[PDB]
Amino acid sequence: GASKLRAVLEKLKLSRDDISTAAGMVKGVVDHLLLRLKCDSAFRGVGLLNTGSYYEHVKISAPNEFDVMFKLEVPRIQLEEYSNTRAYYFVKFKRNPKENPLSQFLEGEILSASKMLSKFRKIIKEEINDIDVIMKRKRGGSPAVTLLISEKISVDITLALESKSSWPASTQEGLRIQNWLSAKVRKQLRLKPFYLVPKHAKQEETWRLSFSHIEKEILNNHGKSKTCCENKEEKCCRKDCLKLMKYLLEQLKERFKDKKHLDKFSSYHVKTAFFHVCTQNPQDSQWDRKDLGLCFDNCVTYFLQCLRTEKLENYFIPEFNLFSSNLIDKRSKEFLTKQIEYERNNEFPVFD
Ligand SMILES: CCCc1cc(=O)n2nc(NCc3ccc(-c4ccccc4)cc3)nc2[nH]1
Ligand SMILES: [Zn+2]
């Protein structure tokens, strides 16, 4: 049916809307960090990616785990695509006022992420002690810093570069929303800046393109009809589908944390699948609140087709396959397929 999914969705909203001092603990820590990074040569133009929002939650099950982004406006950037990866880039500068605020991190002509991250970490490490806050150092690149307030509160900090120039060539054929959100909206969205986060593909001074802000924007204005979800008549189940798929992967990832099979999968994989189903189903009538279950099943069916065909194109970079053999091995994909197919056929036990 579509009854139980609603109760999952009610439990999820009640935790989310519940009164907690958590966001206030987070707010004080980040405002203090931002004030200390600003009175420093390299990070004087630092700020929160989305102001007003400190309470950003990636894990839809964990109301105690926060994720924050620190954007840095980098003017006159030159990017070089690393090893034809389409999403991984070197950072160079057009060079006009040569003694630019980030010249101190230049390793030759290429901008060192590691050098920039070390200073960012060193500035934060020295401000935590000054404050109940403690930091942990975790590999990968970004999140750079991870903070722990009290016992349950956890905060991931990601350093990002902001570029107000045109999106790289690898995105040219991406964001295929023309028949859903319109060609007018695509051009507007693509006029918006883009972010680079420190990341590699297994170790160089590379940066991955990030479009968190586009995702947030589309989600808060997701209909073909401009009035979608504003009234009683136009209530769609798009966000509810996204939430249920996110919960599904989070529940399976917890259920199988002892084994390492679902370690490569994340919300990126679940978000990208949903957005591809949004393109496939552009009409609001295809997302009626009465069809929750049928709608959710088409999301689960598409994701299942992606795992099996080993194909999940990045929504912005269509040549980047999230499900490639070098990214995720067949063994890990087949383990996930079987786990979901059992969930589909047993009235999703994880959701109770
Ligand atoms: C709306 C669709 C979801 C979405 C949100 C967002 O914020 N972004 N930002 C990018 N940028 C390129 C990019 C390329 C690859 C990976 C990746 C992920 C996992 C494993 C291995 C690689 C992550 C980012 N794509 C997205 N898609
Ligand atoms: Zn809607």
UniProtKB/Swiss-Prot annotation:
The modification (Microbial infection) Deamidated asparagine is found at N50, N221. GO terms for molecular function: 2',3'-cyclic GMP-AMP synthase activity; ATP binding; chromatin binding; DNA binding; double-stranded DNA binding; GTP binding; metal ion binding; molecular condensate scaffold activity. There is a cross-link at K13, K125, K184, K216, K243, K246, K259, K260, K311 (Glycyl lysine isopeptide (Lys-Gly) (interchain with G-Cter in ubiquitin)). Mg(2+) binds at E65, D67, D156. The modification (Microbial infection) Deamidated glutamine is found at Q283, Q286. A motif (Nuclear localization signal) lies at residues 132-142. GTP binds at T51, D156, R208, L209, S210, F211, S212, H213, I214, E215. Changing R186E: Impaired association with collided ribosomes in response to translation stress. Decreased interaction with nucleosomes. Zn(2+) binds at H222, C228, C229, C236. Changing K71R: Reduced sumoylation. Changing K27N: Induces alteration of the DNA-binding surface and leads to increased synthesis of cyclic GMP-AMP (cGAMP). Changing C229A: Abolishes stimulation of interferon production. Residues 13-55, 216-239 are annotated as: DNA-binding. Changing K187E: Impaired association with collided ribosomes in response to translation stress. Decreased interaction with nucleosomes. Changing T51Q: Abolishes enzyme activity. Induction: By type I interferons. The modification 5-glutamyl polyglutamate is found at E126. A motif (KKH-loop) lies at residues 259-261. Nucleotidyltransferase that catalyzes the formation of cyclic GMP-AMP (2',3'-cGAMP) from ATP and GTP and plays a key role in innate immunity. Catalysis involves both the formation of a 2',5' phosphodiester linkage at the GpA step and the formation of a 3',5' phosphodiester linkage at the ApG step, producing c[G(2',5')pA(3',5')p]. This is Cyclic GMP-AMP synthase. It comes from Homo sapiens. The lineage of its organism: Eukaryota, Metazoa, Chordata, Craniata, Vertebrata. The gene is CGAS.
